[PDB]
Amino acid sequence: SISNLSMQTHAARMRTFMYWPSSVPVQPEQLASAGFYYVGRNDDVKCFCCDGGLRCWESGDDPWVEHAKWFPRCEFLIRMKGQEFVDEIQGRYPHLLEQLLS
Amino acid sequence: ISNLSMQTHAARMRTFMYWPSSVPVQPEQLASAGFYYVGRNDDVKCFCCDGGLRCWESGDDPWVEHAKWFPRCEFLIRMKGQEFVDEIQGRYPHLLEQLLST
Ligand SMILES: [Zn+2]
Ligand SMILES: [Zn+2]
């Protein structure tokens, strides 16, 4: 089941990036593709499905890889990228929680 | 070892001089688990992994919580063994997941 039903369509999530800051390296179209919509503060985004938030976007960052890095059990992510992809990314970062708790 | 001067059990109990009497976990249970008081609220850190714990509600086990949040702690494993750590880890498989929902 979905966390934000109003942002289920690409068109809608993509509609929120109207005043997405120019200095942010990642583009609104990659973000909307990954299910992320702009919450209207700084560069904070949320996924319409898992309600998982992401911020501090830097050059090279991949919305799909980050989605799998931080919210691996999101139904939408699995369905679009597959369990293999999620397993691989989760494979790269086994000590994520530990690293947060430093 | 993060804090060499909190190595001994006796040095650890000493930091609980200004420990609040309202917090329902005694300095004894906390010093045995490797924790010393850092002087603010009820924040404690382990002399080894430097893991920090707070918000001690009633019925909390310093050893269980050590295993819960800092399972790779050498001191925790030496005192309680890898089996205890695995058991508590299985009781909480989605720990990082529950953090990021807030
Ligand atoms: Zn998601
Ligand atoms: Zn420790």
Numbering used by the authors:
A (entry chain A): 254 to 355
B (entry chain C): 255 to 356
Kindly provide excerpts from the paper associated with this entry.
The suppression of caspase activity occurs in the presence of specific members of the IAP (Inhibitor of Apoptosis Proteins) family. In particular, cIAP1 and cIAP2 (cellular IAPs) are indirect inhibitors of caspases activity, whereas XIAP (X chromosome-linked Inhibitor of Apoptosis Protein) is able to directly inhibit both initiator and effector caspases. In particular, it has been shown that the XIAP-BIR2 domain is responsible for the inhibition of effector caspases, whereas XIAP-BIR3 directly binds to and inhibits initiator caspase-9, which can also be recognized by cIAP1-BIR3.
The four independent BIR3 domains display very similar structures, showing r.m.s.d. values in the 0.29 – 0.46 Å range (calculated over 101 Cα pairs). The divalent Smac-mimetic heads bind to both cIAP1-BIR3 and XIAP-BIR3 in the conserved IBM cleft, between the β3 strand and the α3 helix, roughly lined by residues Gly306, Arg/Thr308, Cys/Asp309, Glu/Lys311, Asp/Glu314, Glu/Gln319 and Trp323, in cIAP1/XIAP-BIR3, respectively. In both structures the two heads of the ligand adopt antiparallel orientations, with distances of 17.0 and 11.8 Å between the N1 atoms of their triazole rings, for cIAP1- and XIAP-BIR3, respectively. In cIAP1 the linker segment is in contact with a hydrophobic surface built by the C-terminal α-helices of two BIR3 domains, in particular by residues Leu354 and Leu355. In fact, the higher affinity of XIAP-BIR3 for the bound ligand can be explained by the cooperation of two distinct contact interfaces, namely BIR3-BIR3 and BIR3-9a free head. Such hypothesis is supported by the existence of a larger interaction surface area for the XIAP-BIR3 dimer compared to cIAP1-BIR3, as assessed by the 'PISA' program (association interface areas of 652/459 Å2, and ΔGs of −6.9/−5.4 kcal/mol for XIAP/cIAP1-BIR3, respectively). Surprisingly, analytical gel filtration assays performed on cIAP1-BIR3 did not show any peak shift in the presence of an excess of 9a. In fact, after mixing together the protein and a large excess of the inhibitor, an expected behavior (K1∼K2) will be the saturation of all the available BIR3 domains by one head of 9a, hampering the formation of dimers (no variations in Ve), as observed for cIAP1-BIR3.
